[PDB]
Write a protein that binds this DNA or RNA. Structure first.
Ligand SMILES: [Zn+2]
Length: 273
DNA sequence: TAGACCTGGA
DNA sequence: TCCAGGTCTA
C-alpha cells in the first residue's frame, strides 16, 4: 500500500469507526506493536478512548483517539476491516480493537510486517515514524524546487530518491516506476543527472499519477483492496509496473523488468531515457 | 546492497 | 526456488 491505497483505505474506514469507543484490544502478534513496546501497555491505554478521526500521512494511517493517536503502517500486506465481534476471525488477524457497540476493527497482515505506534496526539508528529517524513506529493510543500534540491545532493538512482520517504511521502514501487515512465526518465539514472526540465516533468507526472491513482481507488495488483474488500481500478492504467514482457501501451516495445534500488523495476527501454 | 522480518502464490 | 504496493541494516 502506497499513498493511493492507504488514502482509499482511510476514506472507506473512517465512517465505520468514527465515534466508536474502544473496549478492548487483542494482540495475537506482539511484534506489530512498536510503541509502547509492551503489547499489554498498548492495549491498556487504548481502552476507553473514542475514535475521533482518521488521517493519513504518507503511507501511514493516523487514528486520532481521545488523547492518543495510533500510527499504523500496513507495510506490504496490512489490511483493516470492520466486522461484528460475534463472527469468527479471518486468518492472519493479528490485532483486533473491540468497540463498545459490539463491532470491531480487525487488522490482518499475512506477512506480519505492519507496525503500530501509539503516542499522545501532540507527540505523534515529532516522534518516529512520522518525524522524519517528507512532504505530501499533493500539497504545495512538494515542488519541483524540493525534488531538485534533493536530486543534486545525491549520486543514487532517481528511483531510490523517489522511494525515499524523507524526500517525498507516499511513493512506492508501483507509482515510482509509473511516474518515471510518464516523465520519460529511466529509473536507474543518477538523480543528479536530471535536468531542470526533467525534474519539473517528473514532479508533474508524480503529482498527476498519485492523484489519478487516488481517484481510481488505488492499484490492486496482488492483495490490495479497500476496507470493503473492494479492489481498486488503477492497475488498469499502469504503463509499466508488472507488465514486463508485455508490449508498451504507447510504443509496443516490450516492457523491461530489472533490479534498481534493490527493487523490481519496470520501464520502457525506448520511451524512457 | 544482500539480507532481515514473514508467508503464501506461480 | 523466485517474488512481493515497505523499510531498515551490516
Ligand atoms: Zn514505450
Amino acid at each position: 500500500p502506497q499513498l493511493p491505497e492507504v488514502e482509499t483505505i482511510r476514506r472507506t474506514l473512517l465512517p465505520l469507526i468514527v465515534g466508536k469507543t474502544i473496549e478492548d484490544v487483542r494482540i495475537f502478534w506482539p511484534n506489530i506493536i512498536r510503541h509502547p513496546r509492551d503489547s499489554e501497555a498498548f492495549a491498556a491505554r487504548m481502552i476507553g478512548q473514542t475514535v475521533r478521526g482518521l488521517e493519513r500521512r504518507g503511507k501511514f494511517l493516523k487514528f486520532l483517539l481521545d488523547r492518543d493517536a495510533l500510527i499504523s503502517h500496513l507495510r506490504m500486506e496490512g489490511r483493516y476491516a470492520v466486522a461484528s465481534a460475534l463472527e469468527p476471525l479471518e486468518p492472519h488477524t493479528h490485532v483486533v480493537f473491540c468497540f463498545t457497540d459490539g463491532s470491531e476493527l480487525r487488522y490482518r497482515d499475512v506477512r506480519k510486517f505492519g507496525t503500530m505506534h501509539v503516542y499522545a496526539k501532540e507527540e505523534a508528529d515529532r516522534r518516529p515514524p512520522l518525524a522524519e517524513l517528507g512532504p505530501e506529493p499533493l500539497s504545495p510543500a512538494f515542488s519541483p524546487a524540493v525534488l531538485a534540491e534533493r536530486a543534486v545532493k545525491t549520486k543514487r538512482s532517481v528511483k531510490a530518491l523517489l522511494l525515499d520517504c524523507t524526500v517525498v511521502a507516499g511513493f512506492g514501487n508501483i507509482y515510482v516506476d509509473e511516474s518515471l515512465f510518464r516523465a520519460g526518465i529511466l529509473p536507474g539514472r543518477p538523480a543528479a543527472s536530471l535536468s531542470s526540465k526533467e525534474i519539473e516533468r517528473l514532479h508533474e507526472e508524480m503529482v498527476a499519477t498519485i492523484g489519478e491513482a487516488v481517484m481510481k481507488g488505488g492499484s490492486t495488483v496482488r492483495t490490495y483492496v479497500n476496507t470493503q474488500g473492494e479492489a481498486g481500478t488503477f492497475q488498469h492504467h499502469l504503463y509499466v509496473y508488472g507488465r514486463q514482457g508485455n508490449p508498451c501501451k504507447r510504443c509496443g516495445t516490450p516492457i523491461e523488468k530489472t533490479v534498481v534500488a534493490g527493487r523490481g523495476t519496470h520501464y520502457c527501454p525506448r520511451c524512457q531515457r
